[PDB]
RNA sequence: GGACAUACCCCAAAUAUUGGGUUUUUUUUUUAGAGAAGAAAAUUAGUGGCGAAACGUACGGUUUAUGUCAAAGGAGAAGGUGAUUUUAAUUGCA
């Protein structure tokens, strides 16, 4: 309905026009981007407060790697905290080990893979 | 000289507007999304007293009679008498 609307500029867009852009993103917004701010969160979410260092856990680096491949597909600014939260838990990870925490040494898996 | 540590100090970022990092001085506590605000506890009665009988009577136990069922023995195990003769005391039977 976006492509047979008013695209040819009525004055209320015209106002409009001097700092955003596109109707498809002006829409978009409304409906779709409250979903990919729960998503994000959610992938924060689960790697933050429940994976730490824990031993027991591949599927942190499971839930890391598809929220990489889920940044290239929406929003990019939900990447820059991914990337510090990564490393903050890494520093995180590499000081004390008071835990079942990762002993990040020649064990293949926890530490390399 | 003033302010500054959750930094008021740096980095970053456009459909992005909030993610990250860093200085000393003393103790301080063993973590950090929780425990509190329920899930079952105390209960006594206005619980009369004393108390039989006719009747009816169970599985049994011991003892006495009874049939039957194992192995045994035919010197046996030993019961029946006027079938016999003379005899004083003992044991006496063939």
Not at 27 to 45: G, H
Not at 58 to 79: G, N
Not at 86 to 112: D, F, G, K, Y
């Amino acid at each position: 309905i976006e492509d047979l609307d008013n695209i040819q500029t009525p004055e209320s867009v015209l106002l409009s026009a001097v700092s955003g852009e596109d109707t498809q993103d002006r829409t978009d917004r409304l409906l779709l981007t409250p979903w990919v701010k729960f998503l994000w969160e959610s992938y924060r979410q689960c790697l933050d407060l429940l994976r730490n260092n824990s031993r027991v856990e591949r599927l942190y680096h499971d839930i890391a790697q598809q929220a990489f491949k889920f940044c290239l597909q929406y929003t990019r600014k939900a990447e820059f905290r991914k990337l510090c939260d990564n490393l903050r838990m890494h520093l995180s990870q590499i000081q004390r080990h008071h835990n079942q925490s990762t002993a990040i040494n020649l064990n293949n898996p926890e530490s390399q893979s």
